[PDB]
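Handover notes (outgoing to incoming on-call)

Open items:
1. major prion protein: sequence verified, structure written out, both below. Nothing else pending on this one.
2. Nothing else urgent.
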Amino acid sequence: GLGGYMLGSAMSRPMIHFGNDWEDRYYRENMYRYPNQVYYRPVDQYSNQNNFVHDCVNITIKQHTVTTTTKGENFTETDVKMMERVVEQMCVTQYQKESQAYY
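major prion protein C-alpha coordinates:
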Protein backbone atom coordinates (compact mmCIF):
# COMPACT_ATOMS: atom_id res chain seq x y z
CA GLY A 1 0.00 0.00 0.00
CA LEU A 2 2.65 2.58 1.13
CA GLY A 3 -0.15 4.22 3.14
CA GLY A 4 -2.33 6.35 0.88
CA TYR A 5 -1.98 4.46 -2.40
CA MET A 6 -1.71 1.07 -4.12
CA LEU A 7 1.90 0.19 -4.91
CA GLY A 8 0.80 -2.49 -7.40
CA SER A 9 2.71 -5.82 -7.18
CA ALA A 10 4.41 -5.20 -10.60
CA MET A 11 3.40 -3.74 -13.99
CA SER A 12 4.72 -3.70 -17.58
CA ARG A 13 7.62 -1.66 -18.84
CA PRO A 14 5.87 0.83 -21.22
CA MET A 15 7.22 1.63 -24.68
CA ILE A 16 6.96 5.31 -25.63
CA HIS A 17 7.99 7.17 -28.76
CA PHE A 18 9.73 10.25 -27.30
CA GLY A 19 9.63 12.20 -30.62
CA ASN A 20 13.45 12.02 -30.93
CA ASP A 21 15.11 8.69 -31.89
CA TRP A 22 17.76 8.93 -29.19
CA GLU A 23 15.31 9.75 -26.43
CA ASP A 24 13.40 6.58 -27.43
CA ARG A 25 16.72 4.71 -27.40
CA TYR A 26 17.66 6.42 -24.09
CA TYR A 27 14.57 5.03 -22.35
CA ARG A 28 14.80 1.62 -24.12
CA GLU A 29 18.46 1.16 -23.32
CA ASN A 30 17.43 1.87 -19.69
CA MET A 31 13.99 0.21 -19.26
CA TYR A 32 15.72 -2.70 -17.41
CA ARG A 33 17.11 -0.42 -14.65
CA TYR A 34 13.83 1.57 -14.46
CA PRO A 35 10.77 0.83 -12.23
CA ASN A 36 8.82 -2.44 -12.42
CA GLN A 37 6.28 -1.19 -9.83
CA VAL A 38 4.61 2.22 -9.29
CA TYR A 39 2.14 3.74 -6.83
CA TYR A 40 -1.33 4.61 -8.08
CA ARG A 41 -4.19 6.61 -6.60
CA PRO A 42 -7.15 5.07 -8.53
CA VAL A 43 -9.11 7.26 -10.98
CA ASP A 44 -12.42 5.98 -9.63
CA GLN A 45 -14.07 9.38 -10.36
CA TYR A 46 -11.58 12.29 -10.64
CA SER A 47 -11.01 11.80 -14.44
CA ASN A 48 -8.01 13.16 -16.42
CA GLN A 49 -4.91 10.96 -16.07
CA ASN A 50 -2.55 13.88 -15.34
CA ASN A 51 -4.50 14.66 -12.12
CA PHE A 52 -3.69 11.29 -10.53
CA VAL A 53 -0.32 10.93 -12.30
CA HIS A 54 0.65 13.92 -10.06
CA ASP A 55 1.15 11.61 -7.02
CA CYS A 56 2.94 9.15 -9.32
CA VAL A 57 5.44 11.40 -11.16
CA ASN A 58 5.96 12.79 -7.64
CA ILE A 59 6.16 9.89 -5.18
CA THR A 60 6.97 6.95 -7.50
CA ILE A 61 9.85 8.95 -9.02
CA LYS A 62 11.09 9.79 -5.52
CA GLN A 63 10.72 6.16 -4.42
CA HIS A 64 12.64 4.97 -7.53
CA THR A 65 15.42 7.51 -6.92
CA VAL A 66 15.92 7.72 -3.11
CA THR A 67 15.28 4.04 -2.51
CA THR A 68 17.41 2.89 -5.51
CA THR A 69 20.30 5.33 -4.83
CA THR A 70 20.29 3.83 -1.31
CA LYS A 71 22.03 0.67 -2.82
CA GLY A 72 24.42 2.89 -4.88
CA GLU A 73 22.42 3.32 -8.11
CA ASN A 74 22.14 6.91 -9.35
CA PHE A 75 19.72 8.20 -11.96
CA THR A 76 20.75 11.58 -13.40
CA GLU A 77 18.34 14.48 -13.89
CA THR A 78 17.98 13.16 -17.48
CA ASP A 79 17.34 9.56 -16.26
CA VAL A 80 14.61 10.96 -13.96
CA LYS A 81 13.05 13.14 -16.75
CA MET A 82 12.97 10.06 -18.99
CA MET A 83 11.34 8.09 -16.13
CA GLU A 84 8.51 10.73 -15.91
CA ARG A 85 7.13 9.48 -19.23
CA VAL A 86 7.41 5.86 -18.16
CA VAL A 87 5.78 6.50 -14.74
CA GLU A 88 2.77 8.38 -16.23
CA GLN A 89 2.39 5.36 -18.54
CA MET A 90 2.95 2.57 -15.92
CA CYS A 91 0.48 4.08 -13.41
CA VAL A 92 -2.16 3.84 -16.16
CA THR A 93 -0.68 0.59 -17.73
CA GLN A 94 -1.66 -0.93 -14.34
CA TYR A 95 -5.26 0.34 -13.79
CA GLN A 96 -5.86 0.43 -17.63
CA LYS A 97 -7.83 -2.77 -16.95
CA GLU A 98 -10.67 -0.25 -16.36
CA SER A 99 -9.06 3.02 -17.58
CA GLN A 100 -8.61 1.94 -21.22
CA ALA A 101 -11.91 3.90 -21.26
CA TYR A 102 -9.90 7.07 -20.34
CA TYR A 103 -6.37 6.74 -21.80
